[PDB]
């Protein structure tokens, strides 16, 4: 119903993979260049 927010990842970003019950960060990093 609500108008969507644009979240366009077209530039460097930081990201993390976490688990909620422990709160632990399993992985974390920064992407400055996209590779395949």
């Amino acid at each position: 119903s609500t108008t969507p927010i644009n979240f366009h990842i077209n530039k460097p970003f930081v990201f993390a993979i976490r688990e909620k019950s422990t709160g632990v960060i399993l992985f974390i990093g920064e992407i400055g260049e996209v590779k395949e």
Binding site: T3, H8, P12, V14, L26, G29, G32
Partner: protein
């Protein structure tokens, strides 16, 4: 308490020059905590300092590590999680049983006495890494030095499927502005869904769940003119808590690149010394819990892999602590 994760990220980012950084603080702390069970005196104190574990006993660190591994392995059967540990030591050397038994008990360590001169030993170790990472990290070592004594190796593996997957038919070629200012063409995935979202003065934040929502990815996207270096330098438990508690379900039109990155670090060179671990990398190190022989840490090798795509994310890390005479 994710202070070690943020301090390791900040210190790694300061000492490496590559555009991408990708680490598993969980893997590094598990391999170093196995090693810490054998350290005495200042060797142990400096390792606790670098791990942000000062003020905790080994009993509490080991019990926490064990309970954490147990929780992560069973919280979501719809996500694949691996947490494996192994110890490889020089055949004919005496390694103390209390140290082996502590690491078998709290880290489920697989302990092997090996001939480091055998042509079979490097492929046995590297094959173990491949087995514990779905063949995403196939080698942790290229060589074994002649004075090798022991390897303590952790492998973390993750394969999650997005709660709301992208359709590959919606992926389009689009520009991505690199950190060095040049633009490249990428495969830009797209979907419109309900996601966790929040903002602050610097950035936009998104939370993308996997499986039964126990695990998720947090994305921090700096606003125009803002930088990831500033995000990294400002991250700490307080800022992380502000992000997590601020997340609200929001309708979002997401554009995300399909991306992969593989990183390799020698954490002994600059990163762990800056975090406070100095004596363990020298001949003055003391590991009487492991052996009567004078040993020290020569390398802390950390390798990682991540692939994000329309289905989800596959990530792996291996950390090997190399001890030598």
């Amino acid at each position: 308490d994710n202070a070690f994760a943020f301090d390791l990220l900040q210190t790694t980012r300061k000492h490496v020059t590559e555009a991408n950084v990708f680490i598993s603080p969980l893997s590094v702390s598990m391999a170093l905590n196995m090693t810490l069970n054998g350290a005495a005196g200042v060797t142990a104190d400096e390792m606790k300092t670098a791990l942000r574990e000062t003020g905790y006993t080994m009993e509490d660190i080991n019990e926490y590590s064990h309970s954490l591994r147990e929780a992560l392995l069973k919280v979501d059967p719809s996500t694949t999680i691996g947490m494996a540990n192994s110890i490889w030591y020089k055949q004919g050397e005496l390694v103390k049983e209390p140290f082996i038994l502590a690491n078998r008990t709290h880290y489920d360590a697989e302990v092997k006495a090996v001939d480091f001169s055998s042509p079979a030993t490097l492929p046995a170790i590297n094959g173990w890494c491949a087995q514990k990472t779905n063949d995403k990290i196939t080698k942790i070592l290229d060589y074994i030095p002649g004075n090798a004594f022991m390897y303590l190796i952790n492998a973390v593996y993750f394969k999650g499927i997005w709660v709301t997957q992208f359709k590959k038919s919606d992926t389009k070629r689009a520009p991505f502005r690199k950190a060095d200012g040049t633009t490249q063409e990428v495969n830009m995935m797209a979907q419109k869904s309900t996601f966790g979202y929040t903002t602050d003065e610097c950035c936009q934040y998104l939370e993308m769940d996997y499986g039964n929502k126990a695990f998720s990815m947090i994305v921090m996207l700096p606003n125009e003119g803002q930088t990831t270096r500033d995000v990294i330098e400002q991250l700490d438990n307080k800022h992380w808590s502000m992000i997590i508690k601020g997340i609200r379900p929001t309708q979002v039109s997401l554009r995300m690149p399909r991306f992969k990155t593989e990183c390799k670090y020698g954490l002994e060179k600059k990163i762990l010394p800056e975090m406070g671990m100095n004596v363990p990398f020298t001949e003055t190190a003391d590991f009487p819990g492991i052996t009567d022989a004078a040993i020290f840490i020569s390398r802390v090798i950390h390798k990682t892999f991540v692939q994000v795509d329309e289905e989800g994310t596959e990530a792996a890390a291996v950390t090997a602590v190399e001890m030598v005479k």
